[PDB]
């Protein structure tokens, strides 16, 4: 059983809030500017001034903790430098077992709701249960930071809040390492690969890792400063964490081609090269493969050939667990 971060006891706090007829407000991570940040999100910053803390039950008549499953399309980045974290959460959703260790079952805005939620993380060398109240940063009625493509779904916003809490503020999340989030969700072992020196069996390594439910992420180093822009000519984002979400082989004019699928945690802005959603390559595979694999949607998720992947990307991170 997870031990309680700061000694805060989820079920006890929830039960006592319900008894006392109030909603939880978290003394350890309160709905004030110091929970937002210290510089870019500090008390006197332009960003801080626009933000009002509001509960999902203040925003909507029918807020939901999870809608149609806790899945990667529920991870759409907001105005914060936490792409590394969000890439990790998106990858986490592909492994139901680990997902629901981090996101406990049984949390809702209906029966038993008292304005408090909890998540479990690997921290300080322990599995720790972290509570949050459900006051969330909003501007004009919309979440400022992470949000789901399902506008009434709140689990991922609440998990990002819990992760900010253990790190001190949302601003403390700006700029980071995907592998650190992977570890914090698993207590597993992380390794990384230099794609410009890829082992010859790297694609099989990826296949095996995906099959076992390991977490995979990738990025493109900014080698100059951000000279050729943050965005490459083919619509990739440099210095930015992507989730690796599948690896599948297709038959392209009668020959096997290894593909890899990844997802930009923005939930938008995708590769426009071969195998992209609108590319001509799809016209020359088996119709069944096309139907199974290709999804024509601006959703941040796309395929690349493994060959193009290892040319365009520079780093692959893998977190292996038990
Ligand atoms: C810094 C950028 C973030 N990148 C990083 O963290 C990188 C991640 C690695 C895997 C390359 N790491 C990093 O730099 O190390 C900094 C480091 C390491 C250790 C200690 C302190 C600082 C990330 O790209 C990000 O969060 N971008 C969000 C951009 C705003 N935005 C949000 N929605 C957007 C949208 N729809 N469209 C356009 N922009 C959007
Ligand atoms: Ca969902
Ligand atoms: Ca897509
Ligand atoms: Cl408390
Ligand atoms: Cl303030
Ligand atoms: Cl609910």
Curated annotation (Swiss-Prot):
One cellular component term from this protein's GO annotations in UniProt: postsynapse
Known role: Calcium-regulated non-lysosomal thiol-protease which catalyzes limited proteolysis of substrates involved in cytoskeletal remodeling and signal transduction. Proteolytically cleaves CTBP1 at 'Asn-364', 'Gly-377' and 'His-399'. Cleaves and activates caspase-7 (CASP7).
Domain Calpain catalytic: 23-322
Naturally occurring in which organism (per UniProt): Rattus norvegicus
Protein name: Calpain-1 catalytic subunit
Calcium in keyword set: yes
Shown residues within the full chain: 33 to 354 of 713
Recorded family membership: Belongs to the peptidase C2 family.
Listed GO MF terms: calcium ion binding; calcium-dependent cysteine-type endopeptidase activity; cytoskeletal protein binding; enzyme binding; peptidase activity
PTM statement from Swiss-Prot or TrEMBL: Undergoes calcium-induced successive autoproteolytic cleavages that generate a membrane-bound 78 kDa active form and an intracellular 75 kDa active form. Calpastatin reduces with high efficiency the transition from 78 kDa to 75 kDa calpain forms.
Keyword vocabulary terms for this entry: Autocatalytic cleavage, Calcium, Cell membrane, Cytoplasm, Hydrolase, Membrane, Metal-binding, Phosphoprotein, Protease, Repeat, Thiol protease
Subcellular location: Cytoplasm; Cell membrane
Subunit text: Forms a heterodimer with a small (regulatory) subunit CAPNS1.
Modified residues (Phosphothreonine): 322
GO BP annotation list: cellular response to hydrogen peroxide; mammary gland involution; negative regulation of actin filament polymerization; negative regulation of non-canonical NF-kappaB signal transduction; positive regulation of cardiac muscle cell apoptotic process; positive regulation of leukocyte tethering or rolling; positive regulation of vascular permeability; protein autoprocessing
Active-site residue list: 83, 240, 264
Hydrolase listed as a keyword: yes
């Amino acid at each position: 059983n997870a031990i309680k971060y700061l000694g805060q006891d989820y079920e006890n706090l929830r039960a006592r809030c319900l008894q006392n007829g109030v909603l939880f407000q978290d003394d350890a991570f309160p709905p004030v500017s110091h929970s937002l940040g210290f510089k870019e999100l500090g008390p006197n910053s332009s960003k801080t001034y626009g933000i009002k803390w509001k509960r999902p039950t203040e925003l909507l008549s029918n807020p939901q903790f999870i809608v149609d499953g806790a899945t990667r399309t529920d991870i759409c980045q907001g105005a914060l430098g936490d792409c590394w974290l969000l890439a990790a959460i998106a990858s986490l959703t592909l492994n139901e077992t680990i997902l629901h260790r981090v996101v406990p079952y049984g949390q809702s805005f209906q029966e038993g709701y008292a304005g408090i939620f909890h998540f479990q993380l690997w921290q300080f060398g322990e599995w720790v249960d972290v509570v949050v109240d459900d006051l969330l940063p909003t501007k004009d009625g919309k979440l400022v930071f992470v949000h789901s493509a399902q506008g009434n779904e709140f689990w991922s916003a609440l998990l990002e809040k819990a992760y900010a809490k253990v790190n001190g503020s949302y601003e403390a999340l700006s700029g980071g390492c995907t592998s650190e989030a992977f570890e914090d969700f698993t207590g597993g072992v992380t390794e990384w690969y230099d794609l410009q020196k890829a082992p010859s069996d790297l694609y099989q390594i990826i296949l095996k890792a995906l099959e076992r439910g390991s977490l995979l992420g990738c990025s493109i180093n900014i080698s100059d400063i951000r000279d050729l822009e943050a965005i490459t000519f083919k619509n990739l984002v440099r210095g930015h964490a992507y989730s690796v979400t599948d690896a599948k082989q297709v038959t392209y004019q009668g020959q096997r081609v290894n593909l890899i699928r990844m997802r930009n945690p923005w939930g938008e802005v995708e590769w426009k090269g071969p195998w992209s959603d609108n590319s001509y390559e799809w016209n020359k595979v088996d119709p069944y493969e096309r139907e199974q694999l290709r999804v024509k949607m601006e959703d941040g998720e796309f395929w690349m050939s493994f060959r193009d992947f290892i040319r365009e990307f520079t780093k692959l991170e893998i977190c292996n667990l038990t």
